[PDB]
Amino acid sequence: NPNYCFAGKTSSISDLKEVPRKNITLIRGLGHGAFGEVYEGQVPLQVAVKTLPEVCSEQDELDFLMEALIISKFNHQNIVRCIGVSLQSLPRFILLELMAGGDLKSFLRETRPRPSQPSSLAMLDLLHVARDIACGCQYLEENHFIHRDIAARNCLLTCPGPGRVAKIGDFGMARDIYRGGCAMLPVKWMPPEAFMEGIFTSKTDTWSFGVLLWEIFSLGYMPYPSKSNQEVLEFVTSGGRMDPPKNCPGPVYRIMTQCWQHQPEDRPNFAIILERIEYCTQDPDVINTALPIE
Numbered sequence: 001n002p003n004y005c006f007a008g009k010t011s012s013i014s015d016l017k018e019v020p021r022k023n024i025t026l027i028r029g030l031g032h033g034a035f036g037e038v039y040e041g042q043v044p045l046q047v048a049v050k051t052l053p054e055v056c057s058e059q060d061e062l063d064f065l066m067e068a069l070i071i072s073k074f075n076h077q078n079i080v081r082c083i084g085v086s087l088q089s090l091p092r093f094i095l096l097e098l099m100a101g102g103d104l105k106s107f108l109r110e111t112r113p114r115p116s117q118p119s120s121l122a123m124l125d126l127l128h129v130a131r132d133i134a135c136g137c138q139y140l141e142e143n144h145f146i147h148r149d150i151a152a153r154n155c156l157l158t159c160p161g162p163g164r165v166a167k168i169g170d171f172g173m174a175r176d177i178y179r180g181g182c183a184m185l186p187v188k189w190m191p192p193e194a195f196m197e198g199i200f201t202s203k204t205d206t207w208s209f210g211v212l213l214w215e216i217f218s219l220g221y222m223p224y225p226s227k228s229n230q231e232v233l234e235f236v237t238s239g240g241r242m243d244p245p246k247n248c249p250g251p252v253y254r255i256m257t258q259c260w261q262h263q264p265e266d267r268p269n270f271a272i273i274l275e276r277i278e279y280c281t282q283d284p285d286v287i288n289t290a291l292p293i294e
């Protein structure tokens with residue numbers, strides 16, 4: 001059984017909390033898409049259940065074990081909790097905090113203000129989501145963990161309603177690297193030194209967070225509209241940057257452009273990003289700005 005080290009502490013599969021299979025009940029599917037299905041479950045404690053296909057390779061098995069180790073060793077309010085695992089019966093389960101709000105990309109798209117729902121979302125809701133994820137990112141940064149795929153699709157919401165809390169919910173890219181192809185690399189979220197030299201640092205996630213910020217304030221649009229992966233690669237490498245999302249306040253767009261500085265040394269760390277998000281949330285001219293109604 002492979003070892004995992006986080007914050008200089010070493011853990012093993014034996015450290016995972018094995019929940020007896022009999023204590024676990026599947027309720028409904030939440031989707032499969034990527035390798036494996038996800039179900040809502042009960043252990044009563046309500047959970048999301050990530051499953052490993054019984055028809056898988058040994059590498060799929062190792063990948064599954066590693067993501068279990070990675071998530072269980074985090075302890076922060078803006079990272080999804082692992083309730084435990086069921087690895088001793090098949091198919092194997094990882095048990096996660098149930099985030100009833102679903103993933104952030106789907107949420108933004110579904111919760112866009114509309115003539116039917118004219119006040120579904122406000123600038124403050126978006127700033128709160130941004131702060132939440134930035135807090136999670138700061139925790140990773142201070143513990144020297146590089147996420148490598150900070151993106152709306154990988155964030156989750158505790159609930160649809162106003163008290164929602166956003167958390168980082170998927171660590172599959174970091175898992176792969178820790179141990180694929182060009183076409184699968186999240187190039188639209190990556191800085192120049194990442195896709196060119198394969199150099200990753202904390203400032204890798206800063207750049208990606210800027211793209212997430214654009215996703216958030218665009219209300220769920222795909223980054224670099226109308227651009228392919230290679231077109232984005234050449235655009236960004238040549239200094240090109242995304243325009244502000246529709247109705248985006250200047251102070252918010254300015255955080256994006258700072259996250260996208262070419263030199264990683266010129267990009268803010270997450271402490272600074274959090275400070276700027278805070279300042280935006282205080283600014284009436286920012287939060288009084290109306291989001292577009294489709």
Ligand SMILES: Cc1nn(C)c2c1-c1cnc(N)c(c1)O[C@H](C)c1cc(F)ccc1C(=O)N(C)C2
Binds near residue numbers: 038050096100155
């Ligand atoms: C209720 C619900 N509805 N939807 C649409 C989803 C959920 C949901 C709720 N809580 C938890 N923990 C998960 C999913 O976790 C999985 C692993 C997961 C994690 C990340 F980051 C992204 C997508 C994702 C996923 O696979 N979804 C299907 C998203």
